[PDB]
Design a binder for this molecule. Structure first.
Ligand SMILES: N#Cc1cccc2c1CC[C@H]2NC(=O)c1ccc(Nc2ncnc3ccccc23)cc1
Length: 336
């Protein structure tokens, strides 16, 4: 046991499958979004209580907490808008239209220093997700676009974004299965390589930032050498219920969810990784036998888990696991 489990609670205010659930930067609030466009904002320490609740008139695809103003939440729509929501004042500060032909705001990342954010904006899905997309850099102080990064070889939908600790690097994964790493000082692509057969769903810097981790449609979790483009450090086939597609089957009726939120999350120092499964969160130790072996199973879910988070605050771990029945389990972990 590398962790003791201090409790497992259920947040149940959503009645639809969860799309995203993320802990804020203070580590004390959750923002969660379901497929019916219900945004909920809630605390959990010492009990679960709801701070805000709103139906979006518009489809909502993405969610990102601000880094340097804890109470601000960025929301990306399916109608080409970025909304800035004040969780404390329970009102929208602004909603900016993206003056373009790319309505799907698939991914939002706020810079660590708080002066900037990035969003991906994609064309409509085809009657694949292998469609044109853009990557936009914004100024948080004006909430205006500054520039778009050209994507080679072609405009492509970007599914996932993450900054490094300082914010000078941004790693992205796209629907063409390619990872693109951007130098955010020079505003150019430092590095790119083919990462997955099919889509990249999540990307993350290792704690030490010598590697980035990725998970994608081919079912593989891969660790890449940030110093040498496309050189793998290690590669594992996760169980299929880590990357879906996620099915809840009734009389010939089923609900199907393709990955959209973050499929993996890490402890404070990046030694352990939480993933999805039919029946709850599954945690692995990083670092490297041939078959990656599971050290902890959080359980507690009676419908597929589709997205997860992991935050550490007051020296305690909080794991979120969110399933297709709309339930969010909040498990509390102590690192011995
Ligand atoms: N860390 C972080 C971080 C992340 C995202 C955001 C922000 C931060 C820190 C600063 C904060 N920005 C703001 O609070 C804000 C709020 C509104 C405005 N702009 C407008 N407000 C009203 N009407 C407008 C109409 C047309 C255009 C613009 C408008 C600018 C900044």
């Amino acid at each position: 046991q590398p962790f003791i489990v201090l409790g497992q609670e259920e947040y149940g205010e959503h009645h639809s499958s969860i799309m995203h659930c993320r802990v804020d930067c203070s580590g004390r609030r959750v923002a969660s979004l379901d497929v019916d466009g219900v945004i909920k904002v809630w605390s959990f320490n010492p009990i679960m209580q709801t701070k805000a609740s709103s139906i979006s008139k518009s489809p909502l695809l993405s969610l990102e907490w601000a880094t340097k103003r804890d109470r601000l939440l960025l929301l990306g729509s399916g109608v080409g808008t970025v909304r800035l929501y004040d969780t404390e004042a329970k009102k929208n500060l602004c909603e900016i239209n993206i003056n373009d032909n790319m309505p799907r705001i698939l991914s939002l990342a706020c810079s660590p220093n708080g002066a900037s954010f990035v969003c991906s904006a994609a064309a409509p899905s085809l009657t694949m997700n292998q469609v044109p997309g853009r990557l936009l850099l914004w100024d948080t102080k004006t909430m205006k676009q500054q520039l778009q990064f050209s994507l080679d070889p072609e405009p492509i939908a970007i599914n996932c974004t993450a900054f490094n600790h300082n914010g000078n690097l941004l790693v992205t994964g796209a629907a063409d299965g390619v990872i693109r790493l951007f130098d955010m000082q020079q505003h150019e692509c430092a590095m790119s390589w083919r990462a997955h057969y099919g889509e990249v769903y999540s990307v993350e810097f290792s704690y030490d930032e010598n590697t980035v981790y990725s998970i994608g449609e081919d079912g593989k979790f891969i660790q890449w050498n940030i110093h040498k483009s496309g050189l793998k450090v290690s590669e594992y086939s996760l169980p299929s219920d880590a990357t879906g597609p996620f099915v809840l089957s009734y009389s010939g009726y089923k609900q199907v969810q393709v990955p959209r939120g973050r499929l993996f999350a890490f402890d404070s120092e990046g030694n352990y990784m939480l993933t999805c499964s039919a029946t709850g969160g599954v945690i692995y130790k990083l670092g490297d036998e041939k078959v990656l072996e599971s050290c902890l199973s959080l359980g507690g879910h009676r419908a597929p888990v589709v997205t997860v988070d992991w935050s550490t605050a007051m020296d305690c771990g909080t794991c979120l696991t969110a399933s297709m029945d709309g339930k969010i389990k909040l498990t509390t972990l102590l690192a011995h």
